[model samples]
Target chain A: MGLEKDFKRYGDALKDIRTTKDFLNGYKNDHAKEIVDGFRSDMSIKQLVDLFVKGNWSAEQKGALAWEIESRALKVTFQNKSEKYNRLFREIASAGVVDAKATEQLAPQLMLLNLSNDGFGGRADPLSKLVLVAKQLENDGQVGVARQLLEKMYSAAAVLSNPTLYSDSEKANASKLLSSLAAIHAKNPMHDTSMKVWQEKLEGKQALTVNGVVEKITDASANGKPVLLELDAPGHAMAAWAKGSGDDRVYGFYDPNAGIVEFSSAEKFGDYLTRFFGKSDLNMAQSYKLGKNDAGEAIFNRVVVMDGNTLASYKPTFGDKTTMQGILDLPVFD
Target chain B: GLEKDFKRYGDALIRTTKDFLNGYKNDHAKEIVDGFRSDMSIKQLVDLFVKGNWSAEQKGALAWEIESRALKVTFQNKSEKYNRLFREIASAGVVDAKATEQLAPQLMLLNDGFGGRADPLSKLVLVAKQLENDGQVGVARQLLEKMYSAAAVLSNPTLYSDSEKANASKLLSSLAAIHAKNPMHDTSMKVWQEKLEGKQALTVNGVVEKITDASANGKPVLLELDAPGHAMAAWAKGSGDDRVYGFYDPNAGIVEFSSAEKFGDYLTRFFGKSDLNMAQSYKLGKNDAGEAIFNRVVVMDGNTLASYKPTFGDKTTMQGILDLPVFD
Candidate 1:
């Protein structure tokens, strides 16, 4: 008999057993092995996976069938391009997701299968399916197993991005697959290394506010003994004072989302900001103003000082042009 | 038995294969052959084909066509199975790969019928739309999410072509718009919109505090600049009791700083030593003989302020001391 026929026959037999809920519920190991043996005798590893989805087996039964198929497939040698092996890996991955207990057991084997094949022909399909299964696993809090599958998928995708190995179109498909993998990885709470790298690449060092606005320090000065910084917040601005100098500089961070200022020292504040905006040398002064708008909401305005042939004039705007006479009229800083 | 079967069917198989190969070869061979010689002999043409003697232009075209076909076939097959899997998951709440096993052959049929122009996702989306029309809104939503997820994944800027990325972006936006219309998915749609819009600024105080800390610590502070329509500007940084102030134009590429006592030095480079002396002696107000003074020092534009030029414009653009007592 051909492998497909044998697969169909095996599925038919399983269906017959499944129909008898009594037999299925009892967990007939002997009968399951008999059906497994029947399929194994007719087909090599290359044809094994054709039987995986043949019947409507419960999670437990599918787990058992997967184990049996895995053991049998291991004993047989197949080419890397064997469509059967690819299908088997995909089936086992899907089945693993369906059966919580089986996921841990099958994860290693799935990893092996993923690494063994280049995602060509029917191979890419199974890999894609595995990605979805991994996602399901991740959502279920089985991060360890999900991470393994994701890493493997990521590695396989890296291969697809190679110019010599794939055409532009093939690379395009790979790019899509990578994107899916990356999106899933981003949600991983443990912050896997891949996700970390991806985050850095995607976000760079730009800091984001709760309102999705770009926050930046537009002005800084050490004129008033203690350094002061003017930050350009979304729809507003802020001025804060740095109390100390060097590593001892103490200035708190004002979180717009939380409406709170945090950090007791300048070092802590700088470290926190570094996570979002990279490194900088600017310092905050010892005093700060949290200006409020008409509606009692916090508003930020760029502050500029004119001290020159002109008198010292302060405005809540950056680059406010005034005549030479205007500077002369203002009080001078001692 | 295998040998006997091969002997019987081998000629037919070869003929079919030859016909297929020949069809492609004929379509391209004429142009390629003409590029070499119009009256070339069969052997010569065959030799040329073997030797790869075709022009670079011909080879490039051939490579493109062949590569495109391979990619199209790969996409068609993958998309068919993917769409089927998506549908099964949407409808049955279970993934039965076997149930959708027939999609591959179906995709082939469509490809053949369309003369290879069939788009797998386009067909899938059409089906999804139909499901929506049939009041299977939940299933339709699920399918659209899957499609959007796949499209988003494929839209990686580093991996995809411009057109491919644009297509994915368009598809994602469309899906987000649809979800936005549904109140149940309002939050999810908002999140998607945020991701699509890219990074947002954090709190202004937060940034300023960080910059101030960095500056006080003597670290290299990189300030984000904005050029408003203004001229007069001043920024100062001090170590210990000494403060160095400069004309600050956030819009300008560079700023030149002169010490409070170097008013003469700056003018000497610009106009003359006499001009420098006059600038140093110049005072603002009457009792202000000890008050800060200004000079008509020219500032260089662009990224450098080293060169000396003689011109007078706004006092805001000059180097001057603002009411500082002399260092005597």
Candidate 2:
């Protein structure tokens, strides 16, 4: 019966707690029971947002307060289709604050709200907000939680019939988010789940084509062995190799400034090489023969690698010629 | 009684006095003079031997000094003869100027002797005139400019030889013709003209004078010229046109120049390759007196034209050119 007065008291009391610790204390102390009772007794979403905005709080405390308001508002039977809730979501999304625990608590509710709105306007825009928040979380040294959020987003994207419905801007933001997560995976090496997600997204049709070769080279580096690619052409025969794994992978491109660009798909790789060699009046068979000899010698030497760091480790072949050397040196296979 | 004393003591007294005037402290000087007595007068022997003239008799006396005096005896005189000695040694392929300076104290002494016809300063001028008469105008003008500079710096101008003064005036008069003969003179004049403008000294005659001086000295000239944006440009160019190109930079302090043909050949020789696209670029800056100071050089290679490690000051002929007097 006194729910209105209770809400007023709770909001006023929250204003008195200046420090984050003091606010936490007030929430856990007598004010916590009052907030719970107010929510159960039909306190409005507008009132909750008023209380949230009024409280003097740190980023973490604000996150905690938002989570508490959203959690309690979800339980009680109240009108969820109010403009005040959308306003609250928009305000929180645009705030650019990060709190791992609070984000984890509110994530499910925000996801549901985002889906119901078909990922448009203020309500649907919260998903993008979540991605931004995860980015902030990653930047704030909450990498573990950021990785979790990114993985969830990846799964959501996979399930959607048309992910482009998320809008080009949203897709670009998601791609940036995934790239950050991939960089972390590339460094830590233990985050295989994130790595898998990154790989899947990359190989998927919706993959962003920018720096795709660099990404592939970085991934190949994580394999901890030398990966070689050959460019067979007349007077411009060359081979590139990447050795070691992760950020430490060395990359070497032995040719420059003419033909063979936009090395994207595997088929494009062969097509450009074929055309480049064909222009030299050398047939594919003869070009391969000469290219193999050059690449064979190069691969054995401790030359520079594709990562632009570290020389490839050299190992000697016992004999000058091996029986299967003909097939092994073929530029087409690499 | 007087004649008897004069016969024995007069010669010895004359020898001792001559030794003292020639800056000799011991009997070795007397011995040298006596050894060269048959060839020339005691005074002439002292003068020529001290001046480092390489006559057969002087060589014999010098050898005797080396043996008897354990190299303690030295000829301390500065004359054109000593300069010729140094030049001869240099032409024979020992190009250590410091060693020449140390070994040839007579030249240094005369250089430090304020100014005189017998001084190294005057000697350099006289030799340059001789070189000019022999069709070596380039070398002649270089020495004439050097003497002019020395005369300007010395406290006593009257001590300079009348011959040196006349030769210097002649050099100044014929500067235009001499400059025309020098292939790099145009490039050097261009750099000087620009540099004079950069210095904000718009006096046209002064700029011409500076360029003529640079050409005469056979040194590259650097000038500070005003550029379009109120920025100052440092221009450096050599005294000859064929091998030297004018270098210009909008910034006043630093100077840079690049040549694909010249540097390419150097790089080709270095890398042992026939066909390589290469270029060399040099950088220099100005000192307090607006003299050009060499900093470093960069060699760019390949289609990408990636820069290799830079070489610092006075390491190459290109570097030496940047440190020339005009730049200085």
Candidate 3:
């Protein structure tokens, strides 16, 4: 009774947010900060995605929601909140002038938090590095070479049968990757589910910046849909988080001496992108196009061009930042 | 006048100490000096005096004890930074228009700290002394120096009180005798800087040409009350319009200040009575205001015919030898 009392106490904290639809309408209206206070009490990715795609909120409200995400995102040790908030940051940073403007004011501070060595986010990992090599191959119009790497990674000796993921929807993504690798060797192989989904949804669709890709994956990861990332680098490396149980280990770098180096988190993957690519702007990515394949079947291929504005972000400062101070609560000196 | 007033106060205190030593008809100078050697606080010295109150000499010793103890507390410390901080910073040697800005607030807080009219500079001196002895010499020096600069900085509503300024001036003079290497004009005087023992400072007497020449070389003289016949036992920094030279007379119950002529008279009389009076003469020279007084004293050693001229210069410099290695 005591345990249920505490649980129910939290359950009642969201009195106006008992249902998923209640959260959507309240989020679409201007009650974001109030609703965000109930973020972990009992919530759904379905409700979160609905909130992400909904279009009616004003810039100030969008900024409020973005601030709420920034405050919750990097602070938690719990996996679910960590993944959710980080994804939310990516989506809000992409929403153009209003929310993205507010989100980018927090960029310096957020970057500092993520780059801190004490597990705010960034870490180097081996598998994450291999994924970048695969994507580097993928973005170079060599998806076949990128596929071989996935095959090789699956066949590695110490590969775990079950890997850690932040959520259940993320857990389902490892199947296509496994099936894609398996189909290469089997006589009657299973169809590649990821390709058909990308063709149906992303064919002729414009690709996004690394941050934009994060926004894309935010919904895709929640809904158990497939998506891929193109590295902002022109030729050297790419990180395709689409094939992983968690994007945590699906991003990496292509080192001249080491072959491939992996970053364990999006925060970590991004930490060295500017240095690795040797460019200030890195949003140049592969946009999808209809293409011919064997037997004239419908197929989609990624085509990239060098466009400056495609990679550039217009982040403006907005409103009184004192309200956003909760996320910025940190030491002045390192 | 500020610098002269600053360094002269200790000059007066030293003479006042000599009067207490000569005993107000009951000498307790040796006893006071002995008690001072132990570096005891006022309470400790007073308590010891009570223990020895069995004698009249003990009673007299009690009267001069705290003053003698203040003498040592102001001047003697294991670290020269502690001593110099007491002089240059706490006592207001460095307090100018620039230094006072920073020094004012710190001195202000430390000044009225215990109330009952304790000097702010001396309070900080005690703090700096504690900090220095407790293995924080670097921190103590920087703290006091920063306070000195701020205190000297020009600020509105003048940060330091005249009383606090006088207190620091007195403190500065107390430590001035240690190693204030203000160079003398005469070559015979050059030998005086080699060893300045006891409370008597090395004299730096000269006229406009000599002091100005020395000032140009960055060794401008800080004056000393050059009592040729007697030793400088104790002194204090004094304040007034002019630099007052106070003397401890045997007949007088109090201290006496000398005029320009009287100063020359004392110098003449003291040397005249001594064997070195061998030969001394004074020429009545006009000062900046063209008032002819006994402005110059020429003293000749019995062995040599070389005449040493003693005259005050119009200006002085602050830069000098600030450090002497401590026993600790």
What digit string (tens of lDDT, one per residue) describes model 1 on residues A240-330?
3333333332343222121112233333333434432321211111112333444543333333111111111212112444321221222
What is the full ranking by TM-score, best candidate first?
2, 3, 1
Q: What shift in Å separates residue A327 of candidate 2 from its native position after superposition?
A: 29
* Model 2 spans with C-alpha error above 4 angstroms: A1-225, A228-237, A243-252, A255-275, A278-334, B1-226, B229-328
Model 1's interface RMSD = 32.9
Residue B46 shift from truth in candidate 1, angstroms: 12
- Candidate 3 Cα misplacement greater than 4 A, ranges: A1-205, A217-227, A230-237, A242-264, A278-334, B1-328
lDDT of 2: 0.28
Per-model lDDT: 0.28, 0.28, 0.27
Alpha-carbon error at A298 in model 2, in Å?
20
Residue range with the least summed lDDT across 10 consecutive positions in model 2 chain A: A307-316
Most TM-score-accurate candidate: 2
Give RMSD to native, each candidate: 40.1, 41.8, 40.4
Candidate 3 - chain A - TM: 0.23
Clashes of each: 35, 22, 40
